[PDB]
RNA sequence: CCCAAUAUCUACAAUCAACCAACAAGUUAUUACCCUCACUGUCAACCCAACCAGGCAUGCUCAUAAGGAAAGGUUAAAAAAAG
RNA sequence: AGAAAUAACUUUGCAAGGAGAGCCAAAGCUAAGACCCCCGAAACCAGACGAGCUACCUAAGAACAGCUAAAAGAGCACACCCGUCUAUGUAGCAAAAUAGUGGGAAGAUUUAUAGGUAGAGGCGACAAACCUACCGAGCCUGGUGAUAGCUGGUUGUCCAAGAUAGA
RNA sequence: GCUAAACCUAGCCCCAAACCCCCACCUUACUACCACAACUUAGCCAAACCAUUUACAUAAAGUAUAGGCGAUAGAAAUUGAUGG
């Protein structure tokens, strides 16, 4: 007789408790008997560097010049990204200079996204 | 408060909006359009006045049509614009005795038709007035193609009326092949219904389906960024090594 | 309602079943035949009523020998289960089948009649005037569905040109193809008649219950 | 007597549409928009398959075409 | 003795008046289109 | 078809306008009903010969329902239309 | 987000589609990766992404309810600066 | 919180299940897979009766190892209630 | 809690014509001024919501000590269910309880859990019994400001005329 | 002497104009992840009951006409169209 409060996995009997989860992610599968199996991949392996001889902190010092936003935009990155190979090859058919038509056979998928921050 | 514009200007303004606003203008001169169908349930005062026994003088008098209604079921035949009548009468046919609900269904039945331009044999319910109209048509393609719209009544029928008008358009050989002059023979003697191909396919698609394929139609995957900015690149070097 | 009636199986198997009982509600939900519900669990056994189906890639009349004899639940008679070849089917009894025994199941229709044991299906037109006969079937290769109820006699009164008259329990008379198959006797479990059940909890646990209305 | 009542089969499929039914006719369905929609001409879509085949979906060829399939028919008597 | 007849069960408080029964029906629809109209901001039980 | 006309007198409506009606505007009187009409004749010539009515070449008016389910769905007749009776006359005219 | 529009021209990198929920509001529904294709989901294709005819009066009341709230907050707008302008 | 597919099967009760006696009749063979413990309930003097000598399924203790307090202080009139 | 026309009366304009088209006109037309309430049924019809209480039914579960008697809708009697008679209580501890006395208590019993039947309908071991405390016909929203020859009301000052044939 | 008594605006009503707007979510909604379908207003209410009947620019005109010719219903031809 309670609607407003939110709904979560503590409210019903057992069978509700169990099957709502809580916002966590899934990283394997129910086999038979209730058994769990989970699969090394489905698990995020975080990938953290190598943080020694890092000459950056948290924080800057105070002691820093201002300057504008300028927001990069798909103009400014292919200003500086391909176009100076293309016009030192213009002094003397996309593929060579970076474009990549499709996104099949490539690891990080740019569209769909197929990989994760 | 009040709207800028009356309840009944909204459909029309819908059409003028957004997807709806880029579909081919015949189509939609064909939807707005509205016809009156030819009568079926009622007999039509002949003129447009009449004198009147009561009284004697010249009145008016309009041709007010009944009301029919087409069960979903009929939209997969030919009914021809027949229909159901829901209404009441008076039970001895005295204005003081009971007004009795009543509801007069058409005598349905199904038959098998051959159409030329199809070449294919259909089968489809239809009514007594169906095969007269037929009859009084000279062939069963005949009357689904010089029919209008709103006579028929029928999305089957229209969807005929479609398929015969591209046959016709195209002129495409998969008629009958392995006999041309039969292909000519049929294809001239229905060359008055012989309008273009941007307007046969539309014919008779409802609005739903109209958007669709005007959807499908537009639908692109949006073209990569950096083949236009090296366009825009290779126009602006050119200029610049040209002059 | 979300009713799905329990008669959903295909394959045939002697096996009992699980019945689900209907208390008189039909699919709508809404108590269709009054006096019906509660009442022991039963269980369902598929009997076969076809009594001439020969096996799988075979023909001809084919003899199958009984097992047991046993009550059920569902039917007032009493069903057997008979093995012949590599198959078992549960088959309406007579009165007088005990374990053992063996029955003949025959479409053969003889010069004459053949004298036939009270146990035996034959097509109607090969048993003569005057006996008894179960299991009729209103036309050839349908199934058994008139006489089957517990103790009840049917009488073949004549044979015509391609048919035959046989008088039902009920004291009239019907038309039939001499080919179709019945059974020669008088079904099992006579004098079940004779049932004083004594108290209205029988009547309970049969399954019926005493409803007022029934408008 | 057949068994299973007709109640609890699959189903007839539905009528189809009549446009698939015009020789030069190429309907509109509610393919191009991924979702069902009551006033369209329900697709036919081709039969899917699975390029890999995951183990907890697999579904095993029919008896006929497993490699060890012989025509006489054994009689085993197990436990 | 009355009073009590509200014996709760979230099963049954679930399946007879939640968001799917709601919208497994026409008239369900349409009170969930009422109660969003009125403001309400508890549409299903 | 059920021909039907109103009971109740419509009131006119103009030129533009629609007319609006009432509660009192669907009782109905049966005019009569098209079926029970006394059975019509239609008119149609033939490609062929069936000689329990005739013979190519000519105009026959025969009933309804065996036009329709024998002598047209078979090539043996054609309606007689205003397209077809300029045509056959050539295949007299050979001969 | 630049190297996206460079490589294939798309604005959102999930991708989504207009539709309309059963209550016949225009939605931006965004797409869930799923593995079987979507005719054969027993569960997607009991979502209604149309509109029965039903609603389409609840669609007119709620353009109208929010019309009002509009007037509302113009026209006392207009007050606040009459009154602005008479001190 | 579950289960890979297909075919096969799956006739005989439960009652200490054995004697008598009854009726209401009560999974595997082939094919595919060499993966591991994630996620959620876990509190209390509590719930349905507007706050309550009422209602509340099962297991175990059968008078308690657990749980509680019938008298705010006084006097001992009538009428009333229980003994 | 007194909203308004048909005439009439009063005061203006113009007057055989009035009126800023349509209307009236044998002194009439045009304009203004004056005069007609509030609360309340049982109901009716339409569309939604309800079988977590109760009636019945379904699926799969659970309980029934001890004694007497042995396969029984058996006897005495706990748990459990019901509620015979009396007293307390009557805004009560409780919108039907408490204390005693009682009927059943291996059965047509009792009961937890999910599902089903929906309102002129359901269900009913027929009592007009029950369908969320109020059922000879649930409840909510809408038509609805239902209608009411019936009941109740109807608000500043002062003066004046003012009552009981009949159809 | 307590209790109180007093206040202004927060907003709103009627017009005019202008056509209005990251993740999760139909399973037990707000849950990353597996094989059907949509398409005539009855009646309260008037007739002092009730049964046919009963309403949903200006002018022509409440005229023709309909109607237990009762209650009531009712055209057309033509005419011309930012504020309190
Ligand atoms: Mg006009
Ligand atoms: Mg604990
Ligand atoms: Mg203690
Ligand atoms: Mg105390
Ligand atoms: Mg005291
Ligand atoms: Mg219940
Ligand atoms: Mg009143
Ligand atoms: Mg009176
Ligand atoms: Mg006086
Ligand atoms: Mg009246």
Redesign the pocket.
Same mark, same amino acid.
């Not at chain 3, 044979?159 to 080919?179: C, D, F, H, Y």
């Not at chain 5, 709760?8 to 679930?14: A, D, V």
């Given at each position: 007789?309670?609607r407003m409060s939110?709904?979560?996995?503590?409210?019903?009997?057992?069978?509700?408790?169990?099957?709502?989860?809580?916002?966590?992610?899934?990283?394997?599968?129910?086999?038979?008997?209730?058994?769990?199996?989970?699969?090394?991949e489905?698990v995020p392996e975080f990938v953290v560097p190598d943080l020694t001889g890092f000459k950056l902190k948290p924080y800057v010092s105070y002691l820093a010049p201002e300057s504008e936003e300028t927001p990069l935009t798909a103009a400014q990155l292919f200003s500086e990204a391909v176009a100076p190979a293309i016009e030192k090859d213009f002094k003397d058919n996309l593929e060579k200079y970076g474009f990549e038509p499709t996104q099949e056979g490539k690891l990080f998928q740019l569209y769909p996204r197929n990989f994760l921050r | 408060?009040?709207?800028?514009?009356p309840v009944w200007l909204?459909k029309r303004?819908?059409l003028?909006?957004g997807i709806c606003s880029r579909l081919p203008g015949h189509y939609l001169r064909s939807l707005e359009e509205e016809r009156t169908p030819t009568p079926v349930h009622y007999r039509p005062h002949g003129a447009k006045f009449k004198i009147?026994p009561?009284?004697g003088?010249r009145?008016?008098v309009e041709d007010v049509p009944i009301?029919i209604?087409?069960?979903?079921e009929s939209?997969r035949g030919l009914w021809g614009g027949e229909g159901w009548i829901?209404?009441?009468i008076?039970a001895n046919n005295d204005?003081?005795?009971?007004?009795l609900?009543?509801?007069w269904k058409p005598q349905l039945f199904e038959r098998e038709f051959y159409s030329e331009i199809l070449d294919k044999k259909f089968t489809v319910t239809v009514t007594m007035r169906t095969l007269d109209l037929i009859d009084e048509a000279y062939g069963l393609d005949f009357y689904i193609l010089k029919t209008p719209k709103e006579d028929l009544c029928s999305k089957f029928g229209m969807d005929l009326k479609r398929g015969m008008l591209l046959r016709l358009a195209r002129q495409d050989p998969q008629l009958h092949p392995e006999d041309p002059e039969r292909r000519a023979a049929i294809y001239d003697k229905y060359k008055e219904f012989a309008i273009p191909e941007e307007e046969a396919e539309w014919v008779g698609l409802t609005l739903?389906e109209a958007i669709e394929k005007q959807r499908l139609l537009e639908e692109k995957d949006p073209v990569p960024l950096f083949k236009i900015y090296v366009a825009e690149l290779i126009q602006q070097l050119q200029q610049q090594a040209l002059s | +309602?979300?009713?799905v009636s329990?008669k959903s199986?295909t394959?045939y198997?002697?096996?009992?079943?699980?019945?689900?009982?209907?208390?008189?509600?039909d699919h709508?939900?809404?108590?269709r035949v009054?006096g019906?519900?509660?009442?022991?669990?039963?269980?369902?056994?598929m009997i076969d009523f076809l009594r001439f189906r020969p096996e799988e890639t075979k023909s001809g009349p084919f003899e199958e020998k009984v097992?047991?004899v046993?009550?059920?639940?569902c039917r007032s008679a009493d069903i057997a289960?008979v093995?012949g070849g590599s198959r078992?089917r549960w088959i309406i009894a007579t009165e007088n089948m005990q374990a053992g025994d063996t029955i003949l199941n025959s479409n053969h229709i003889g010069r004459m009649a053949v004298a036939a044991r009270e146990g035996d299906a034959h097509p109607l037109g090969a048993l003569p005037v005057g006996t008894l006969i179960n299991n009729v079937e209103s036309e050839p290769g349908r199934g058994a569905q008139y006489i089957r109820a517990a103790g009840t006699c049917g009488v073949l009164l004549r044979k015509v040109n391609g048919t035959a008259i046989i008088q039902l329990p009920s004291k009239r008379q019907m038309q039939v193809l001499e080919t179709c198959v019945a059974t020669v006797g008088r079904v099992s479990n006579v004098d079940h008649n004779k049932?004083v059940?004594?108290? +209205?909890?029988?009547?309970?646990?049969?399954?019926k219950?005493?409803?007022?209305?029934?408008? | 007597y057949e068994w299973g009542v007709r109640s609890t089969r699959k189903?007839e499929?539905?009528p189809l549409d009549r446009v698939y039914e015009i020789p030069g006719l190429e309907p509109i369905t509610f393919a191009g928009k991924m979702?069902?929609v @009551?006033?369209?001409a329900?697709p036919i879509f081709p @039969?899917?398959?699975?390029g890999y085949?995951? @183990?907890?979906?697999?579904?095993? @060829?029919?008896?006929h075409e497993?490699?060890?399939?012989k025509d006489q028919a054994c009689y085993?008597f197990?436990? | 003795?009355?009073?009590?007849?509200?014996?709760?069960?979230?099963?049954?408080?679930?399946?007879?008046?939640?968001?799917?029964?709601?919208?497994?029906?026409?008239?369900?629809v349409?009170?969930?289109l009422?109660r969003m109209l009125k403001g309400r901001?508890?549409?299903?039980? | 078809t059920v021909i039907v006309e109103r009971?109740?007198?419509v009131?006119?409506?103009?030129?533009?306008?629609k007319?609006?009606?009432?509660?009192?505007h669907?009782?109905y009187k049966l005019v009569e009903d098209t079926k029970h009409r006394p059975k019509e004749n239609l008119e149609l010539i033939l490609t062929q010969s069936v000689e329990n009515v005739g013979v190519r070449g000519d105009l026959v008016s025969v009933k309804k329902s065996l036009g329709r389910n024998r002598l047209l769905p078979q090539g043996l007749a054609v309606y007689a239309s205003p397209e077809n009776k300029k045509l056959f006359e050539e295949e007299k005219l050979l001969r | 987000d630049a190297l996206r529009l460079l490589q294939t021209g798309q604005e959102?990198?999930?991708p989504g589609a207009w539709?309309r929920?059963?209550?016949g509001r225009?939605?931006?529904?965004?797409f869930?990766?799923?593995?079987?294709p979507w005719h054969? %989901?027993?569960?997607? %294709?009991?979502?209604?992404?149309?509109a029965?005819?039903?609603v389409d009066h609840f669609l007119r009341l709620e353009?109208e309810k929010?019309?009002?709230?509009?007037?509302?907050?113009? %026209?006392?707008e207009?007050?606040?600066a009459?009154?602005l302008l008479k001190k």
């Amino acid at each position: 007789a309670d609607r407003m409060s939110k709904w979560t996995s503590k409210r019903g009997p057992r069978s509700f408790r169990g099957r709502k989860g809580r916002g966590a992610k899934g990283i394997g599968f129910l086999t038979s008997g209730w058994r769990f199996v989970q699969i090394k991949e489905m698990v995020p392996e975080f990938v953290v560097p190598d943080l020694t001889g890092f000459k950056l902190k948290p924080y800057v010092s105070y002691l820093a010049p201002e300057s504008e936003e300028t927001p990069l935009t798909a103009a400014q990155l292919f200003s500086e990204a391909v176009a100076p190979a293309i016009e030192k090859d213009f002094k003397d058919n996309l593929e060579k200079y970076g474009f990549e038509p499709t996104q099949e056979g490539k690891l990080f998928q740019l569209y769909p996204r197929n990989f994760l921050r | 408060p009040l709207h800028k514009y009356p309840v009944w200007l909204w459909k029309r303004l819908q059409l003028r909006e957004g997807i709806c606003s880029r579909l081919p203008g015949h189509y939609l001169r064909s939807l707005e359009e509205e016809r009156t169908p030819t009568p079926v349930h009622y007999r039509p005062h002949g003129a447009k006045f009449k004198i009147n026994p009561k009284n004697g003088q010249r009145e008016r008098v309009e041709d007010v049509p009944i009301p029919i209604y087409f069960p979903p079921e009929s939209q997969r035949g030919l009914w021809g614009g027949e229909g159901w009548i829901l209404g009441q009468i008076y039970a001895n046919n005295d204005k003081l005795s009971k007004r009795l609900k009543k509801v007069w269904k058409p005598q349905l039945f199904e038959r098998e038709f051959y159409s030329e331009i199809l070449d294919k044999k259909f089968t489809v319910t239809v009514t007594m007035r169906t095969l007269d109209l037929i009859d009084e048509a000279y062939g069963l393609d005949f009357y689904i193609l010089k029919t209008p719209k709103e006579d028929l009544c029928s999305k089957f029928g229209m969807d005929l009326k479609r398929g015969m008008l591209l046959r016709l358009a195209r002129q495409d050989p998969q008629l009958h092949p392995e006999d041309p002059e039969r292909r000519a023979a049929i294809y001239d003697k229905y060359k008055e219904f012989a309008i273009p191909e941007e307007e046969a396919e539309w014919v008779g698609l409802t609005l739903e389906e109209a958007i669709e394929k005007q959807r499908l139609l537009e639908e692109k995957d949006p073209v990569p960024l950096f083949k236009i900015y090296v366009a825009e690149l290779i126009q602006q070097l050119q200029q610049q090594a040209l002059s | +309602a979300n009713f799905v009636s329990w008669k959903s199986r295909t394959k045939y198997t002697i096996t009992p079943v699980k019945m689900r009982k209907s208390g008189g509600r039909d699919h709508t939900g809404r108590i269709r035949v009054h006096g019906i519900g509660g009442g022991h669990k039963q269980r369902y056994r598929m009997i076969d009523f076809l009594r001439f189906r020969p096996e799988e890639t075979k023909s001809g009349p084919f003899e199958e020998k009984v097992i047991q004899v046993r009550y059920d639940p569902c039917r007032s008679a009493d069903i057997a289960l008979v093995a012949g070849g590599s198959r078992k089917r549960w088959i309406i009894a007579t009165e007088n089948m005990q374990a053992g025994d063996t029955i003949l199941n025959s479409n053969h229709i003889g010069r004459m009649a053949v004298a036939a044991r009270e146990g035996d299906a034959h097509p109607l037109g090969a048993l003569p005037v005057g006996t008894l006969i179960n299991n009729v079937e209103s036309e050839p290769g349908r199934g058994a569905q008139y006489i089957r109820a517990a103790g009840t006699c049917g009488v073949l009164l004549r044979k015509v040109n391609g048919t035959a008259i046989i008088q039902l329990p009920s004291k009239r008379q019907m038309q039939v193809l001499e080919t179709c198959v019945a059974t020669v006797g008088r079904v099992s479990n006579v004098d079940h008649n004779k049932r004083v059940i004594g108290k +209205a909890g029988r009547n309970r646990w049969l399954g019926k219950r005493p409803n007022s209305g029934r408008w | 007597y057949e068994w299973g009542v007709r109640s609890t089969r699959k189903s007839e499929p539905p009528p189809l549409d009549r446009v698939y039914e015009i020789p030069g006719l190429e309907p509109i369905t509610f393919a191009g928009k991924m979702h069902f929609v @009551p006033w369209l001409a329900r697709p036919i879509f081709p @039969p899917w398959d699975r390029g890999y085949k995951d @183990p907890r979906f697999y579904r095993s @060829p029919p008896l006929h075409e497993h490699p060890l399939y012989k025509d006489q028919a054994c009689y085993i008597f197990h436990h | 003795a009355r009073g009590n007849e509200y014996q709760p069960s979230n099963i049954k408080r679930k399946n007879k008046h939640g968001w799917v029964r709601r919208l497994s029906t026409p008239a369900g629809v349409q009170v969930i289109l009422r109660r969003m109209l009125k403001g309400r901001k508890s549409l299903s039980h | 078809t059920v021909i039907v006309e109103r009971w109740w007198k419509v009131p006119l409506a103009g030129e533009g306008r629609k007319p609006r009606l009432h509660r009192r505007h669907r009782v109905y009187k049966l005019v009569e009903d098209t079926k029970h009409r006394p059975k019509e004749n239609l008119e149609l010539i033939l490609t062929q010969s069936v000689e329990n009515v005739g013979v190519r070449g000519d105009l026959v008016s025969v009933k309804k329902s065996l036009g329709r389910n024998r002598l047209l769905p078979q090539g043996l007749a054609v309606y007689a239309s205003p397209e077809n009776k300029k045509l056959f006359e050539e295949e007299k005219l050979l001969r | 987000d630049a190297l996206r529009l460079l490589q294939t021209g798309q604005e959102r990198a999930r991708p989504g589609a207009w539709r309309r929920d059963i209550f016949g509001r225009i939605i931006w529904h965004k797409f869930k990766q799923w593995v079987i294709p979507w005719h054969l %989901n027993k569960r997607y %294709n009991r979502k209604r992404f149309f509109a029965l005819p039903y609603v389409d009066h609840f669609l007119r009341l709620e353009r109208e309810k929010r019309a009002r709230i509009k007037a509302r907050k113009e %026209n006392l707008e207009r007050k606040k600066a009459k009154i602005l302008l008479k001190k």
